């Protein structure tokens, strides 16, 4: 009945929107940073454990407090203790069982998720981890934003492939998409298939592939476990984007290629087995021992030897030409 408990919550949220920086007096600055850090810690534990505290007027105050503190200009950081508490408070706000997306959708709009994506270019890996979790939760709770979030993530990827070729959050964004792909509907819609062929595959061309390669490979494998039909244009694309210059970079392609073979269908294997083992034979005879060791590890794979024993008439003449011939 009395809004004293709700009014104090709104007071402390609005108090955290004061970007004061006292300067001049160092003691007053430390006192201000303390009371803001204390208020944030108080609200974090309050919203996590107390029940029925997220009332309807609380929603616009939380989103405003997050926007005033987080949506800033990225430096080219000593204020991280405050930033981390705001990420934690917002995450506990989204994860609360009392959180109602029907109310927060009025304030978690497209303009909000756009400014949230701009923060993924932060150089701080701790910040990108909080952004990764935050956007993953917004996607899963706001169906009216899922189409927009997928569209804007692609715009960041198209710019990263054909323009700037510089973005520090490529790995975190790909980690989010891996959970969306794992839940894709039965007949993969055309939007998702165009995303695989024209976004995920061209991501192997960028020079900085070594930074987001584990995440990129996971999205490619999950696409083939949903629809095995896409195995042929994926494998042929990796062979196209394969580093013709023998370098340690092609060890990453060998890992992605075995992870694909672990989920490939037999009927889909025979359609690309010849061009694949022709590249694989080039790796087992490569001057770089590190890439030959990784290729020779394919024989240790139990499932891969089964596909070779079933296609020995065509695969063996390619791997060991001095010992096996072929004909009609």
């Amino acid at each position: 009945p009395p809004a004293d408990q709700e009014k104090l919550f709104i007071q402390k949220l609005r108090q955290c929107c004061v970007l004061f920086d006292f300067v001049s007096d160092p003691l007053s600055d430390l006192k201000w940073k303390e009371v803001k850090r204390a208020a944030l810690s108080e609200m974090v534990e309050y919203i996590t454990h107390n029940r029925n505290v997220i009332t309807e007027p609380i929603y616009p105050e939380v989103v405003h407090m997050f926007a005033v503190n987080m949506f800033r200009t990225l430096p080219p950081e000593a204020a991280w203790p405050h930033l981390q508490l705001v990420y934690e408070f917002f995450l506990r706000f989204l994860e609360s069982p009392d959180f109602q997306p029907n109310i927060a959708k009025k304030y978690i709009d497209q303009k909000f998720v756009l400014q949230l994506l701009e923060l993924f270019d932060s150089e701080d890996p701790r910040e990108r981890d909080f952004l990764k979790t935050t956007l993953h939760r917004i996607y899963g709770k706001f169906l009216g934003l899922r189409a927009y979030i997928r569209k804007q993530i692609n715009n960041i990827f198209y710019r990263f492939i054909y323009e700037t070729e510089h973005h520090n959050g490529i790995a975190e964004l790909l980690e989010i998409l891996g959970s969306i792909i794992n839940g894709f509907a039965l007949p993969l819609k055309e939007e998702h298939k165009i995303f695989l062929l024209k976004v995920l595959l061209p991501l192997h061309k960028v020079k900085s592939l070594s930074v987001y390669h584990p995440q990129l490979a996971y999205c490619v494998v999950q696409f083939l476990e949903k629809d095995s039909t896409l195995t042929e244009p994926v494998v042929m694309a990796l062979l196209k984007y394969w580093p013709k210059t023998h370098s340690p970079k092609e060890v990453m392609f060998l890992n992605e290629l075995e992870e694909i073979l672990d989920v490939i269908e037999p009927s889909e294997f025979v359609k690309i087995m010849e061009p694949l083992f022709r590249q694989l034979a080039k790796c087992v005879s490569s001057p770089h021992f590190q890439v030959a060791e990784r290729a020779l590890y394919y024989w240790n794979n139990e499932y891969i030897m089964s596909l070779i024993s079933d296609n020995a008439a065509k695969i063996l003449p390619i791997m060991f030409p001095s010992l096996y011939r072929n004909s009609k």
Binding site: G140, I176, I180, G183
Partner: peptide, 10 residues
Amino acid sequence: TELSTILEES
């Protein structure tokens, strides 16, 4: 943080 699966459609 491994991120749980997000179902496209129920």
